[PDB]
């Protein structure tokens, strides 16, 4: 449900994620990279299931960050897809894909895959 | 069938893959790059379902190549997972993961992901 997803979260590499869950299924906020810093802040946008199957199932969700802001442009975008699991220690478990803009000849190696776990603070 | 899989297959990049399929499930052969070339050749090994289902379901299969031979060593390895579909235009549809050996600090972006379709033409 919206309330529980809203807040500040951190993953195992030390990155920050700040998010608001709206009543229509929308997600908005900010992703911060290299151990905080002032502006290595980027915009994020996503969607979640607002009427979850409830008994003890997780809530499905996902979001995108394109790595460009007013100071830097890495010419790449990452998408995270996973689930929210409430409890006394709430968690988000994800798998992610990172794609870079390449020339035709290098498109075969444009995408990296990995996984992150987020803890609410 | 095993001898359906047995042969020479080509992907959309020009790479040639030569495989022998054994009756009990073994897969063995050679992979080579640079649309031919002399020792652009590497060894491969794998496994496949030797007793598939009897409606029009494909045959599941997979294999590994480590990228070291007598002349080169790229300190990486690729695995392909997919299925075989027979008939007049037989095909092998796959997705693959490439992992490189890294230092701890570079472990987060060790793995690339992609997809390949192999035909006999």
């Amino acid at each position: 449900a919206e309330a529980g997803i809203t807040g500040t979260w951190y993953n195992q590499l030390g990155s920050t994620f700040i998010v608001t869950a709206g009543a229509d299924g929308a997600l908005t906020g900010t992703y911060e990279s290299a151990v905080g810093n002032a502006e290595s802040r980027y915009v994020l946008t996503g969607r979640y299931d607002s009427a979850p199957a409830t008994d003890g199932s997780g809530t499905a969700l996902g979001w995108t960050v394109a790595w460009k802001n007013n100071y830097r442009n890495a010419h790449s975008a990452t998408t995270w897809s996973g689930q929210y699991v409430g409890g006394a220690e709430a968690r988000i478990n994800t798998q992610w894909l990172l794609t870079s803009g390449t020339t035709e000849a290098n498109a075969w190696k444009s995408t990296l895959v990995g996984h992150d776990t987020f803890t609410k603070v | 069938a095993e001898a359906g899989i047995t042969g020479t297959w080509y992907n959309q990049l020009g790479s040639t893959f030569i495989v022998t399929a054994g009756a009990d499930g073994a897969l063995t052969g050679t992979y080579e790059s640079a649309v031919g070339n002399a020792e652009s050749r590497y060894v491969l090994t794998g496994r496949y379902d030797s007793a598939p289902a009897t409606d029009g379901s494909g045959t599941a299969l997979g294999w590994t190549v480590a990228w070291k031979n007598n002349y080169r060593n790229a300190h990486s390895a690729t695995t392909w997972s997919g299925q075989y579909v027979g008939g007049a235009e037989a095909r092998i549809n796959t997705q693959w993961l490439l992992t490189s050996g890294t230092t701890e600090a570079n472990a987060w972006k060790s793995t690339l992901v992609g997809h390949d379709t192999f035909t006999k033409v």
């Binding site: 590499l13 990279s33 290299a34 151990v35 290595s40 790595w67 830097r72 | 600090a105 987060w108």
Partner: peptide, 8 residues
């Protein structure tokens, strides 16, 4: 040093 990674 990509912004999704650690201080790199």
């Amino acid at each position: 040093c990509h912004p999704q990674g650690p201080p790199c």
